[PDB]
Amino acid sequence: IGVKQLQREIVLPGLVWTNPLTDFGGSKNDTITVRVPAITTANRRDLRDPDRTVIASELVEHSFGVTLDKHVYAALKFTDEQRTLDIRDYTKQVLMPQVSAVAYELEDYIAELIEGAPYEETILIDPADTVPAFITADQRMGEANVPTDSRRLVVGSAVAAALAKDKQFRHADWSGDQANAALREAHVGRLAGMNVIRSNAIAPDKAYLWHRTAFILAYRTPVVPEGAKAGASFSANGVALRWLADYDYSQLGDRTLLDVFTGRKVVTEVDGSFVRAVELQLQASSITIVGGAFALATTTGTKQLKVRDDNGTDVTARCTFASSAGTKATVSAAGLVTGVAAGTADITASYVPPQGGTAKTATVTVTVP
Amino acid sequence: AHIFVKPELVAEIGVKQLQREIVLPGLVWTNPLTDFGGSKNDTITVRVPAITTA
Amino acid sequence: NRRDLRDPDRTVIASELVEHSFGVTLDKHVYAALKFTDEQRTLDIRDYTKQVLMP
């Protein structure tokens, strides 16, 4: 029998505008220019005014550019000694992991696109009541006259858990769902008029709401060259990758490459302000080091600390660590603690909250043997 | 190396400048008076009837 | 991995496929044993499948 390694699901590639336009090859610098049609301004005169001149309006079309600028690949140095030696059923022991790796890389690419956008403010989600934050997000997207259809909402694991824990969705009288789909099932489905899609690619304590015309992904399958011994077009989650395999030379072993050309764009407005998507972050109030007080294996032992906020989000990568007594044990900037002498020490973790202000502080005791 | 000559390919993919919806004109009392031409200073007077107290 | 398009540095970073395994081994002997003298088996025990096997 076999147990698979734990790998996340794939949601993002289906929720993003993909290949609106093609034929990047027949354009200068591999850029397609998208034309935004013009709008006009009117004017107001006064009746029976002695001067009879009219202010002539203007009709200026705008434009932006979409470009292919990245090339995602998963190369394998598949030495021929390994082939027919340990690798059996090539179609499932190497090809499937390679395809899955490229799919996960594309999902990470889209996730970096979505998270890395010019969001001028972040909408704070109060864990006690979360609906006001989502209603505020809807209101923000309504102030920009964004269409109300084809709006996608993606929430991290922490936000979904907080929504389920919210008394607004958990108490039946407060939600009107006399089946408690947030208590029997741990799944709140619809709120503030938008569906919920759970993802782990995005940061755990963040949610993003975007219109369809806010992010653009452009894909191109590389053409299988004539001089390639083995070529195929193994597909992916809506993407057609290209797989090509050299057989010899250098090491007299196989070398495989599974790749696709990719490009991203965030559709900003004509004034360079991003209003077609909004982001929300879960408000945090306290942090605690998981595991509490502990002891190391040796005097020079190493243990990797982990800090969770009150919402369960791990904030290890976002915390500053200090040691009360470094002569007995010191703590790195990434949470790793190494002992240098026998005895106890006190470690302080400081985390600036998303809402801002005084950082939350959590103190733990480490007893190096 | 190789040098190619290629167009620009301006495209339209449905991205348009965002505009407000129009809901106000159908809500206000429009055109109860029309004969503005046949009146002095283009002004039509409206007469509110008298009321009295006992 | 990802690389820039039309990059003159035409190199590819190879990836690694490592497959692990772990074992489950037998280490305990769960037993229940009953010893009956011949008199006990003859006289004292009246119904074997109810007085001995079931417990």
Rounded to 5 degrees, what are φ and ψ at A73?
-140, 160
Cα separation, A79 vs A196, whole angstroms? 45
Cα separation, C30 vs A341, whole angstroms? 46
- Here the tokens at position A13 are 């590639």
Instruction: Kindly list the residues from chain C whose CB atom is less than 8 angstroms away from the CB atom of residue A101.
Output: 15
Q: Which of A68, A75, A109 lies nearest to residue C5, judging by beta carbons?
A: A68
Measured in whole angstroms, the distance separating CA A107 from the mean position of its chain's CA atoms is 8
Q: Which strands, in side-by-side order, build the sheet including A302-304?
A: A302-304, A336-339, A329-331
Side chain identity at A353, as an amino acid letter? Answer: P
Determine the 3-state secondary structure of A5 from DSSP. coil
Cα separation, A105 vs A165, whole angstroms? 32
- Cα distances from A206 to residues A17, A114, A122, A166, in angstroms, run 21, 11, 10, 16
List Cβ neighbours of C13 (8 Å cut-off, separation of 6 or more).
A75, C1
Of B14, B11, B19, B21, whose CA–CA distance to A275 is shortest?
B19
- Cα distances from A77 to residues A227, A253, A305, in angstroms, run 19, 8, 36
Task: Indicate the pairing of strand A194-195 with strand A190-191.
Answer: antiparallel
Determine the 3-state secondary structure of A269 from DSSP. coil
Contact B11 A275 (CB under 8 A): no
Counting CB pairs under 8 A, whether chains B and C reach 3 or more, is no
Side chain identity at A319, as an amino acid letter? Answer: C
Cα separation, A231 vs A236, whole angstroms? 16
List Cβ neighbours of A11 (8 Å cut-off, separation of 6 or more).
A154, A197, A198, A199, A201
Q: Which of A27, A34, A145 lies nearest to residue B13, judging by beta carbons?
A: A34
DSSP tag of A15: G
Of A93, A92, A94, A98, whose CA–CA distance to A74 is shortest?
A98
Contact C14 A75 (CB under 8 A): yes
Alpha helix ranges (H) inside chain A: 90-93, 95-115, 131-143, 157-165, 167-170, 172-175
Q: Which of B6, B12, B17 lies nearest to residue A26, judging by beta carbons?
A: B6
| CA-based nearest distance C31→chain A, Å | 28
Instruction: Kindly list the residues from chain A whose CB atom is less than 8 angstroms away from the CB atom of residue B15.
Output: 34, 36, 213, 267
Measured in whole angstroms, the distance separating CA A2 from the mean position of its chain's CA atoms is 30
Q: Are A304 and A336 a contacting pair, CB within 8 Å?
A: yes
Cα separation, A319 vs A304, whole angstroms? 13
List Cβ neighbours of A82 (8 Å cut-off, separation of 6 or more).
A253
Of A223, A33, C7, A70, whose CA–CA distance to B7 is shortest?
A33
Determine which of A31, A76, A78 to mutate to test the interface with C (most C C-beta atoms within 10 Å): A76
Return the CA Rg of chain A.
Answer: 27
DSSP tag of A315: -
Q: Name all chains with 3 or more CB-CB pairs below 8 Å to chain A.
A: B, C
Cα separation, A94 vs A79, whole angstroms? 13
Work out whether the CA dihedral A240, A245, A246, A252 comes out positive or negative.
positive
Q: After which residues is chain C broken (C to N over 2.5 A)?
A: none
Q: Which strands, in side-by-side order, build the sheet including A123-125?
A: A123-125, A277-282, A206-211, A151-155, A197-198
| CA-based nearest distance A151→chain B, Å | 15
- What are the residues of chain A with a beta carbon less than 8 Å away from any beta carbon of chain C? 30, 68-77, 93-94, 97-98, 101, 105, 109, 255, 257, 261-262
Cα separation, A136 vs A118, whole angstroms? 18
Rounded to 5 degrees, what are φ and ψ at A134?
-70, -35
List Cβ neighbours of B22 (8 Å cut-off, separation of 6 or more).
none
Side chain identity at A76, as an amino acid letter? Answer: L
DSSP tag of C43: I
Rounded to 5 degrees, what are φ and ψ at A146?
-70, 135
| CA-based nearest distance A98→chain C, Å | 9
Determine which of A27, A73, A86 to mutate to test the interface with C (most C C-beta atoms within 10 Å): A73
- Here the tokens at position A252 are 């007299």
Of A355, A15, A7, A32, whose CA–CA distance to A208 is shortest?
A15
Q: Which of A36, A39, A144 lies nearest to residue B15, judging by beta carbons?
A: A36
Q: Which contiguous run of DSSP H or E holds residue B9?
A: none
Contact A28 B8 (CB under 8 A): yes
Residue of C nearest to A75 (CA): C14
Q: Are A175 and A169 a contacting pair, CB within 8 Å?
A: yes
Cα separation, A317 vs A333, whole angstroms? 9
Side chain identity at A293, as an amino acid letter? Answer: A
Measured in whole angstroms, the distance separating CA A242 from the mean position of its chain's CA atoms is 25
Q: Are A259 and A120 a contacting pair, CB within 8 Å?
A: no
Query: ∠B27-B33-B39 over CA atoms, to 5°?
Result: 150
Beta strands in chain B (DSSP E): 10-11
Cα separation, A42 vs A54, whole angstroms? 10
* Burial class of residue A81, CB neighbours in 10 A (0-12, 13-18, 19+): exposed
Q: Are A332 and A321 a contacting pair, CB within 8 Å?
A: yes
Of A291, A289, A350, A286, whose CA–CA distance to A318 is shortest?
A350
Please report the number of interchain residue pairs, chain A to chain B, with beta-carbon separation below 8 angstroms. Answer: 56
Determine the 3-state secondary structure of A152 from DSSP. strand
Residue C39 C-beta-side C-alpha neighbours within 13 Å: 0
Q: Are A362 and A286 a contacting pair, CB within 8 Å?
A: yes
Residue of C nearest to A254 (CA): C14
Share of chain C residues as helix, strand and coil, in percent rounded to the nearest 5: 25, 10, 65
| CA-based nearest distance C27→chain A, Å | 20
Rounded to 5 degrees, what are φ and ψ at A302?
-125, 130
C-beta neighbour count of A358 within 10 angstroms: 8
Cα separation, A183 vs A55, whole angstroms? 63
Beta strands in A184-317 (DSSP E): 190-191, 194-195, 197-198, 206-211, 215-220, 230-232, 242-246, 255-266, 277-282, 287-289, 294-295, 302-304, 307-309
Q: Are A144 and B19 a contacting pair, CB within 8 Å?
A: no
Q: Is A145 on the interface with B (CB under 8 A)?
A: yes
| CA-based nearest distance A197→chain B, Å | 25
Cα separation, A196 vs A211, whole angstroms? 14
Side chain identity at B42, as an amino acid letter? Answer: D
- Which of A:25-54 have CB within 8 Å of B? 25-28, 32-37, 39, 47
- What are the residues of chain C with a beta carbon less than 8 Å away from any beta carbon of chain A? 1-7, 12-15, 17, 19
Determine the 3-state secondary structure of C2 from DSSP. strand
List Cβ neighbours of A299 (8 Å cut-off, separation of 6 or more).
A339, A340, A341, A342, A368, A369
Q: Are A181 and A221 a contacting pair, CB within 8 Å?
A: no
| CA-based nearest distance A95→chain C, Å | 11
Question: A135-151: b or e for each residue (b if 16 or more CB lie within 10 Å)?
Answer: ebbbebbeeeebeeeeb
List Cβ neighbours of A182 (8 Å cut-off, separation of 6 or more).
A163, A164, A166, A169, A170, A175, A188
Task: Indicate the pairing of strand A230-232 with strand A287-289.
Answer: unpaired
Contact A75 C12 (CB under 8 A): yes
Which residue do the tokens 């299988």 mark? Answer: A224
Contact A71 C12 (CB under 8 A): no
Q: Are A281 and A313 a contacting pair, CB within 8 Å?
A: no
| CA-based nearest distance A163→chain C, Å | 35
- Cα distances from C22 to residues A3, A6, A156, A217, in angstroms, run 10, 16, 33, 41
Q: Are A358 and A347 a contacting pair, CB within 8 Å?
A: no
Query: ∠C19-C20-C23 over CA atoms, to 5°?
Result: 145
- Cα distances from B6 to residues A11, A19, A69, A316, in angstroms, run 37, 21, 18, 50
Determine the 3-state secondary structure of C50 from DSSP. helix
Side chain identity at A189, as an amino acid letter? Answer: G
Contact C2 A70 (CB under 8 A): yes
Q: Are A264 and A335 a contacting pair, CB within 8 Å?
A: no
Determine the 3-state secondary structure of A268 from DSSP. coil
